[PDB]
Amino acid sequence: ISSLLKQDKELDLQIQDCMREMTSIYDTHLPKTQKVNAETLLDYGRKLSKFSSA
Protein backbone atom coordinates (compact mmCIF):
# COMPACT_ATOMS: atom_id res chain seq x y z
CA ILE A 1 0.00 0.00 0.00
CA SER A 2 2.74 2.48 0.91
CA SER A 3 4.59 1.92 -2.37
CA LEU A 4 1.36 2.24 -4.34
CA LEU A 5 0.30 5.38 -2.46
CA LYS A 6 3.71 6.87 -3.26
CA GLN A 7 3.03 6.03 -6.91
CA ASP A 8 -0.34 7.83 -6.79
CA LYS A 9 1.19 10.92 -5.18
CA GLU A 10 3.85 11.02 -7.89
CA LEU A 11 1.23 10.79 -10.64
CA ASP A 12 -0.83 13.56 -9.03
CA LEU A 13 2.33 15.68 -9.04
CA GLN A 14 2.84 14.93 -12.74
CA ILE A 15 -0.64 16.19 -13.68
CA GLN A 16 0.15 19.14 -11.39
CA ASP A 17 3.28 19.91 -13.39
CA CYS A 18 1.57 19.69 -16.79
CA MET A 19 -1.32 22.00 -15.82
CA ARG A 20 1.16 24.35 -14.12
CA GLU A 21 3.17 24.63 -17.32
CA MET A 22 0.16 25.19 -19.59
CA THR A 23 -1.18 27.90 -17.28
CA SER A 24 2.27 29.48 -17.01
CA ILE A 25 2.62 29.68 -20.81
CA TYR A 26 -0.84 31.17 -21.15
CA ASP A 27 -0.12 34.06 -18.81
CA THR A 28 -3.52 35.21 -17.65
CA HIS A 29 -3.96 38.97 -17.39
CA LEU A 30 -6.91 41.11 -16.47
CA PRO A 31 -8.09 43.44 -19.23
CA LYS A 32 -6.68 46.94 -19.41
CA THR A 33 -8.77 49.20 -17.14
CA GLN A 34 -4.18 61.24 -27.95
CA LYS A 35 -0.98 62.01 -29.85
CA VAL A 36 0.94 65.15 -28.88
CA ASN A 37 2.62 68.01 -30.72
CA ALA A 38 6.01 68.68 -29.16
CA GLU A 39 5.83 72.48 -29.30
CA THR A 40 2.82 72.95 -27.03
CA LEU A 41 4.34 70.16 -24.93
CA LEU A 42 7.74 71.81 -24.49
CA ASP A 43 6.27 75.23 -23.70
CA TYR A 44 3.94 73.72 -21.13
CA GLY A 45 6.73 71.75 -19.48
CA ARG A 46 9.01 74.76 -19.23
CA LYS A 47 6.17 76.79 -17.71
CA LEU A 48 5.66 73.99 -15.19
CA SER A 49 9.41 73.82 -14.60
CA LYS A 50 9.53 76.75 -12.18
CA PHE A 51 6.39 75.63 -10.34
CA SER A 52 7.12 71.94 -9.82
CA SER A 53 10.69 72.93 -8.79
CA ALA A 54 11.94 74.10 -5.40
Added chain:
Amino acid sequence: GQKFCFQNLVHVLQDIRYQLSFARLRNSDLVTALDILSTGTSLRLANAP
Protein backbone atom coordinates in the same frame (compact mmCIF):
# COMPACT_ATOMS: atom_id res chain seq x y z
CA GLY B 1 25.50 107.39 7.46
CA GLN B 2 28.50 105.11 6.96
CA LYS B 3 26.74 102.25 8.77
CA PHE B 4 23.55 102.87 6.72
CA CYS B 5 25.89 102.50 3.75
CA PHE B 6 27.01 99.04 4.79
CA GLN B 7 23.48 97.78 5.49
CA ASN B 8 22.06 99.38 2.35
CA LEU B 9 24.69 97.56 0.29
CA VAL B 10 23.71 94.23 1.84
CA HIS B 11 20.05 94.85 0.97
CA VAL B 12 20.93 95.73 -2.63
CA LEU B 13 22.96 92.53 -2.92
CA GLN B 14 20.06 90.46 -1.60
CA ASP B 15 17.68 92.21 -4.00
CA ILE B 16 19.83 91.44 -7.03
CA ARG B 17 20.15 87.84 -5.87
CA TYR B 18 16.33 87.75 -5.84
CA GLN B 19 16.25 89.09 -9.40
CA LEU B 20 18.78 86.37 -10.12
CA SER B 21 16.42 83.56 -9.12
CA PHE B 22 13.82 85.40 -11.21
CA ALA B 23 16.05 85.28 -14.33
CA ARG B 24 17.33 81.70 -14.46
CA LEU B 25 15.26 79.10 -16.26
CA ARG B 26 15.19 75.42 -15.43
CA ASN B 27 14.83 72.40 -17.68
CA SER B 28 11.22 71.44 -18.24
CA ASP B 29 9.48 68.71 -16.28
CA LEU B 30 8.30 66.92 -19.41
CA VAL B 31 7.01 64.00 -17.32
CA THR B 32 4.37 66.09 -15.55
CA ALA B 33 3.59 67.84 -18.84
CA LEU B 34 2.92 64.55 -20.64
CA ASP B 35 0.81 63.30 -17.75
CA ILE B 36 -1.22 66.52 -18.03
CA LEU B 37 -1.63 65.88 -21.74
CA SER B 38 -3.91 63.06 -20.53
CA THR B 39 -5.45 65.46 -17.94
CA GLY B 40 -4.42 63.76 -14.73
CA THR B 41 -1.37 64.17 -12.54
CA SER B 42 -0.58 60.48 -12.79
CA LEU B 43 2.17 61.00 -10.20
CA ARG B 44 0.03 62.34 -7.36
CA LEU B 45 -2.51 59.51 -7.74
CA ALA B 46 -0.28 56.43 -7.98
CA ASN B 47 1.90 57.71 -5.13
CA ALA B 48 -0.90 58.51 -2.75
CA PRO B 49 -2.82 55.96 -0.66
